[PDB]
Write a protein that binds this ligand. Structure first.
Ligand code: HG
Length: 18
């Protein structure tokens, strides 16, 4: 469901790329 506990998955590693 949208963002998830982990991120960084050839999907949003750029979102929480921090
Ligand atoms: Hg991700």
């Amino acid at each position: 469901t949208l963002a998830v506990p982990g991120m960084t998955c050839a999907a949003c590693p750029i979102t929480v790329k921090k």
